[PDB]
Amino acid sequence: AQKRSEKQYNDAQNEINKWQRNAQLALQKGDENLARQALERKKTYTDTSAALKASLDTQSTQVETLKRNLIQLESKISEAKTKKEMLKARITTAKAQEQLQGM
Amino acid sequence: MGLFDRIKRVVSSNLNDLVNKAEDPEKMLEQAILEMQEDLVQLRQGVAQAIAAQKRSEKQYNDAQNEINKWQRNAQLALQKGDENLARQALERKKTYTDTSAALKASLDTQSTQVETLKRNLIQLESKISEAKTKKEMLKARITTAKAQEQLQGMVRGMNTSSAMSAFERMEEKVLMQESRAQALGELAGGSDVDDELAAL
Amino acid sequence: DELAAL
Numbered sequence A: 001a002q003k004r005s006e007k008q009y010n011d012a013q014n015e016i017n018k019w020q021r022n023a024q025l026a027l028q029k030g031d032e033n034l035a036r037q038a039l040e041r042k043k044t045y046t047d048t049s050a051a052l053k054a055s056l057d058t059q060s061t062q063v064e065t066l067k068r069n070l071i072q073l074e075s076k077i078s079e080a081k082t083k084k085e086m087l088k089a090r091i092t093t094a095k096a097q098e099q100l101q102g103m
Numbered sequence B: 001m002g003l004f005d006r007i008k009r010v011v012s013s014n015l016n017d018l019v020n021k022a023e024d025p026e027k028m029l030e031q032a033i034l035e036m037q038e039d040l041v042q043l044r045q046g047v048a049q050a051i052a053a054q055k056r057s058e059k060q061y062n063d064a065q066n067e068i069n070k071w072q073r074n075a076q077l078a079l080q081k082g083d084e085n086l087a088r089q090a091l092e093r094k095k096t097y098t099d100t101s102a103a104l105k106a107s108l109d110t111q112s113t114q115v116e117t118l119k120r121n122l123i124q125l126e127s128k129i130s131e132a133k134t135k136k137e138m139l140k141a142r143i144t145t146a147k148a149q150e151q152l153q154g155m156v157r158g159m160n161t162s163s164a165m166s167a168f169e170r171m172e173e174k175v176l177m178q179e180s181r182a183q184a185l186g187e188l189a190g191g192s193d194v195d196d197e198l199a200a201l
Numbered sequence C: 001d002e003l004a005a006l
Helices: A002-028 A032-101 B004-022 B025-080 B084-153 B163-189
Strands: none
Touching: A002 A032, A002 B084, A032 B084, A032 B163, B025 B084
């Protein structure tokens, strides 16, 4: 979902420059009418770019926290997997000591 | 206050809490989006009718404008063939068309403004629905964050939210107790001297 | 401002 959001942001950003170029093409060929209309429409894209980037930032923060949590969980499971072998060692210690007392 | 009001408030407060437990976020988010889009579709058709009416009005304006020049040409034809009678009568009638042209264009302008506002509103609605469609995925991410964090806490020693940890800790304690039994049985039935070498070196 | 450009 983060990838999708960033792609949308990029596309809106590209269209902003596209309509700026259309305004310049109006200046080269057309007149003030089309040149001004291009930016009139570009208003909306400039709005949406920021309106989207605001949320893209929070999305990025969420993804970072999730990645951190996943790494933490992996580490803790590894710790448990070591504790299992330590417990087996304790079982053997118990049985050895019980063997000694029986003597 | 009343009594029947109070009884019905209790019954309602029970039914509502019964329903609000059945709602599930992952599905109701999608249902809300689906109905959102349905409504947008049904608004498109109203905008389309507005546009069609504008086309009709402009066409009528154009036809009246054309007839103005037609009757001017008829006056000129009278000047070429007929006399002042028909030449003046053509413009006498053309008076009405000149009136109607402006009387119609006045309203055509407002119609155009309305259609422009409607188009703007439709674009705005599309943008907002897209924003909601992104928020849905952000909320799913939040759900996953919540479940991951709840998984992490279940890993701590002193809480029993997770069955796997419950079993793991239970076996751990069982084994520690077994080892303690062995040690106690060892005790029950039954370094100064070597620290001297540390003085040698 | 674009009106100044052209």
